């Protein structure tokens, strides 16, 4: 049930219930339909879950703040350590900056 500390305390709570669906707990707005979130049980079928939650915990509690300092020698680092590929790491690194960005405009 400044941002990095919040990301972990949040993502960690995004597993002990599903992948849960509490996405509709702090949103007074309305939804769309039900035949759409059905593709959420698909990823659950596999013995695994997602690649994101992999290389996510495979990083220092300071390397997630400014992933910009990460180079070609740092991407392959959290790549083999998590089992993912260099490409699967980029999509993850280029996101940590988005959260800390779009948040500023909020």
């Amino acid at each position: 049930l400044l941002t990095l500390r919040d990301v972990y305390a949040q993502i960690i709570a995004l597993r002990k219930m599903g992948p849960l669906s509490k996405v509709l707990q702090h949103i007074p707005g309305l939804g769309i339909m039900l035949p759409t979130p059905s593709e959420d049980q698909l990823k659950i079928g596999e013995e695994k879950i997602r690649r994101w939650l992999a290389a996510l915990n495979s990083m220092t509690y300071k390397e997630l703040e400014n992933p910009n300092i990460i180079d070609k020698s740092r991407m392959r680092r959290i790549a083999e350590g998590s089992g993912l590929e260099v490409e699967e790491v980029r999509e993850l690194l280029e996101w940590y900056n988005n959260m800390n960005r779009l948040l500023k405009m909020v």
Binding site: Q41, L42, K43, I44, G45, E46, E47
Partner: peptide, 8 residues
């Protein structure tokens, strides 16, 4: 309860 799981 979990279609996917039952499949795999």
């Amino acid at each position: 309860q979990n279609k996917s799981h039952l499949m795999e």
